[model samples]
Target: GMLPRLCCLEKGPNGYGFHLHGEKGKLGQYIRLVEPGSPAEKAGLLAGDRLVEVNGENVEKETHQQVVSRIRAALNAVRLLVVDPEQDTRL
Candidate 1:
C-alpha cells in the first residue's frame, strides 16, 4: 500500500505499464513506483501522482474492494486523473 498516487497511465510498446497503491490518504490511489525502461516511465509516470479517477469516472470515494474490482474488470487502457507532485508543490 505504498503507492499513494498515479504518476502515469499511458500505453506504450508493451502496454500500460505501472502499479498503483492505496497505502494511505483520505481519498484516491497513489503511484507507488515506475519501472525503469518501462512504458510507465516513458509516459512520464513519476513518484507522487494521486489518482482520482479511471476512464473518466470519479473514484475518489471508492473503497478498496470496489476500486480493485473496477480496475480488474476493465479491458481497455485505463485513463487516470492524477494530482501531480508539482501540483501539490505549487505555492
Candidate 2:
C-alpha cells in the first residue's frame, strides 16, 4: 500500500529541475534530487519519493528511462504522482 502525493510543477527554462534515479525492473523510481528555488522544490517534490505517475499515466512498471521520456514529452507543466518512502515503509 502507498499514500500517493500529487506534485504539479511548472516547467522552467532548465526543465523541472529534479533528477530521477532507479534501474529498470527495480522496486520503483525515486526522486534523486530537487534543486533549491526550482520549480520542483516549489512544487514540493522531495528526494526518495517513489514515482508512480508521469502526467496522468501510471508508470509503476515503466523503466527509469521510459519515465524520463514521458516527463520530457509533457508540455508546459509536469504532473507527478509519488509515494513518500517514510510513510510507505511505516505502513
Best by TM-score: 2
Q: Per-residue lDDT of 1-56 in model 1, one digit per residue for the tens? A: 34335433445666556677776655557676678887667656666776677766
lDDT by residue for model 2 (1-91), tens: 3347889988898888888999655657889778999999988898989888888998887887788889988877889988887666422
Model 1, position 68: C-alpha lDDT score: 64
Candidate 2 residue spans exceeding 4 A from truth: 1-3, 89-91
- Angstrom error of the Cα, residue 71, model 2: value is 0.2
Best candidate, lDDT-wise? 2
Model 1 residue 38 CA deviation in Å: 2.3
Reference-based lDDT, each prediction: 0.63, 0.84
TM-scores of the candidates in the order shown: 0.63, 0.85
Consecutive 10-residue window with the lowest summed lDDT within model 1: 1-10
